[PDB]
């Protein structure tokens, strides 16, 4: 008729291309411009304010509001970005060292790289070899920077280039300043720039002699605006020698200077509800965003109405420090700000440490369908068997898909219900999206209407594959796979021949029990992580699951040379082991 053929191809991730967002990329992905300090309006029962730091268009932080961009609740919203335009550019604290390295390799008068064409071609040829890795690339770039530092005068112009460094190298605003000592290599060769410098200071010292003591420390400072305008006229052919790929529009040095700040979605900085209803605590990122809006508005109004230049530069430095704390709170001292103490949790603080994203939510994370219980011995269990409490087995469930081979069993489990242990807790129909609790339904019509593709979450029964883990995981045998048996005594029970790989003893030890929820994971666990298939440690190939104490002694007393048994005792012992 009129429908168009739709083609969906499964895809994976081939790689990542790290870069920096330009101004156009920041604005393009934005949905609202944050241009208001006030978070809420008091005239509308403390609703989120339009064009603010908590604008609804950026997402929702509660479960009752709507996004007004995708029209979804808190569960179904991916969050949307905003953007914020600074009145004046400021330095990026993350790219500050990179900015200094770029400035050390370019002429501070014409933005040309301080390299002869022969050295330029040789270094490009070294960089463009097929087998270049990261270490060789960093070495070549360091050699390029060292050669640029040795260039006393530029090549396209006759300008004298000194040394570019930090102002003080500390933890304040002076740590976010770049100074250019132009006359450090001048010596006594009578450079024409020195004549202009001494003429300038002779002219200005006739009016303010008091500055004479401060002439020595006076150097050509590189404010973010001058650095940005210097970066804007860097030739793209020289970007490869500074480490930047110029084939894409985002590969320019001016991308690494803050002009547009992407305001993050409120789904990643949610307002935390407290026990008090009228007041809701806000994340540090939102407060810092409001402070950035306030300072940028102050700077813009000062530019329009002509405030004093000292106040302008002070508020520029305060904006730089505020954005630096917004990125990395440990980079600068909070005491330097006029408002200021517990340091805020910046973006760098959310990514580093054991409690960050990488080591707390990406490499390792909380998992479902797991239980933790004290262990006690059980020699009557097989070595590939662990005894799970009946109470734990009624919570930990396995989703079994109804087939032609297991329809009657799952019908019986649905009839039994969530309370009787050989039973089920949830049922998910083939054409439905929300699983239905079996604690409220009829439990007899559901069993009769059990289709051929439904998924029933049955209780953990005998023979279920469970991962058994002791938390101080030193070697791979510290987590194994066992078959579940169900026992009523509220403790995990494993055979004492198996407690040696776990380094576990029954004096208060607790272990963890994971239940794989996929057939592939279940098979991989039972075939590669089983107790039977892991009787030898991979350290040396020697057995690790074998006789332990109170089993070696009994075996020695049986096999002792003066142990003679009649047929009754022999037969009793043989029935005892089987």
């Amino acid at each position: 008729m009129k429908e168009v053929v739709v083609s969906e191809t499964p895809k994976r991730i081939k790689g990542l291309e790290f870069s920096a967002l330009s101004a156009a990329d920041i604005v393009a992905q934005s949905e609202v411009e944050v241009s208001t300090r006030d978070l809420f309006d008091l005239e509308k029962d403390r609703a989120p304010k339009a064009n603010g730091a908590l604008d609804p268009k950026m997402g929702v932080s509660s479960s009752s509001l709507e996004c007004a961009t995708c029209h979804g609740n808190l569960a179904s919203c991916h969050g949307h970005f905003g953007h914020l335009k600074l009145a004046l550019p400021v330095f990026h604290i993350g790219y500050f060292k990179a900015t200094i390295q770029i400035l050390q390799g370019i002429c501070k008068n014409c933005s040309a790289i301080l390299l002869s064409e022969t050295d330029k071609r040789q270094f490009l040829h070294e960089l463009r070899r097929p087998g270049v890795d990261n270490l060789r690339r960093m070495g070549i770039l360091k050699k390029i920077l060292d050669q640029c530092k040795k260039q006393r005068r530029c090549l396209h112009c006759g300008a004298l280039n000194g040394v570019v460094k930090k102002a003080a190298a500390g933890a304040g605003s002076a740590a976010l300043k770049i100074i250019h000592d132009t006359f450090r290599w001048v010596g006594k060769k009578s450079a024409p720039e020195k004549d202009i410098w001494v003429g300038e200071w002779k002219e200005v010292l006739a009016h303010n002699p008091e500055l004479e003591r401060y002439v020595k420390r006076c150097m050509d400072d590189l404010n973010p605006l001058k650095t940005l305008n210097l970066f804007k006229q860097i030739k793209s052919a020289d970007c490869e020698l500074l480490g930047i790929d110029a084939t894409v529009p985002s590969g320019r040095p001016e991308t690494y200077i803050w002009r547009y700040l992407p305001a993050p979605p409120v789904c990643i900085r949610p307002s935390v509800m407290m026990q008090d209803s009228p007041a809701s605590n806000e994340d540090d990122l939102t407060v810092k965003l409001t402070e950035i809006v306030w300072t940028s508005s102050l700077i813009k109004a000062g530019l329009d109405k002509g405030i004093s230049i000292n106040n302008m530069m002070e508020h520029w430095d305060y904006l730089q420090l505020t954005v630096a704390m917004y990125i990395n709170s440990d980079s600068v001292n909070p005491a330097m700000l006029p408002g200021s103490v517990k340091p805020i949790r910046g973006f760098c603080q959310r990514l580093k440490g054991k409690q960050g994203r990488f080591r707390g939510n990406l490499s390792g994370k909380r998992v479902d369908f797991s239980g933790r219980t004290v262990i006690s011995p059980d020699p009557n269990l097989s070595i590939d068997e662990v005894a799970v409490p009946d109470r734990v087995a009624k919570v930990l469930t396995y989703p079994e898909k109804v087939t032609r081979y297991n329809r009657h069993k799952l019908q019986e489990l649905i009839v039994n219900g969530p309370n009787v242990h050989p039973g089920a807790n949830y049922l998910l129909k083939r054409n439905e999206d929300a699983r239905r609790n079996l604690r409220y339904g009829d439990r007899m019509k559901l069993a009769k209407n059990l289709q051929i593709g439904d998924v029933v979450e049955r209780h953990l029964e005998d023979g279920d594959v469970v991962l058994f883990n002791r938390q101080p995981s030193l070697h791979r045998l510290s987590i194994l796979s066992h078959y579940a048996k169900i026992r009523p005594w509220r403790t995990f029970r494993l055979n004492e021949c198996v407690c040696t790989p776990y380094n576990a003893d029954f004096d208060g030890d607790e272990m963890n029990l994971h239940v794989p929820q996929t057939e592939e994971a279940r098979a991989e666990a039972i075939n590669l992580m089983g107790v039977k298939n892991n009787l030898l440690t991979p350290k040396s190939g020697e057995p690790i699951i074998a006789a332990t104490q109170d089993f070696i002694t009994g075996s020695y007393l049986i096999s002792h040379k003066d142990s003679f048994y009649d047929r009754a005792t022999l037969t009793q012992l043989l029935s005892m082991m089987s």
Partner: protein, 99 residues
Amino acid sequence: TEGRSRDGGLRLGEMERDCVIAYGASQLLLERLMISSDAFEVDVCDKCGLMGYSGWCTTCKSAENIIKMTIPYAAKLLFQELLSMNIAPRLRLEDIFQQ
């Protein structure tokens, strides 16, 4: 969540992940760390690499290159946090089947 007082779950830390790596069980690791914790269906644009919403890329302003994928929610949170840090982790996608 964390702790039995909040009905929390147990942590499969770096050491246990590394033990499972030493066993060679890829599907078990994928089930434990993605399926059972934070699986999330997301829209990925094939041209600009950035993620989208509702089958729509806000950067390219088109729905032609949107691809449904499944990632851990921590990865999406990390990508948004990096985008707030002026870092663009543009994903590059390829077909699973060589064809």
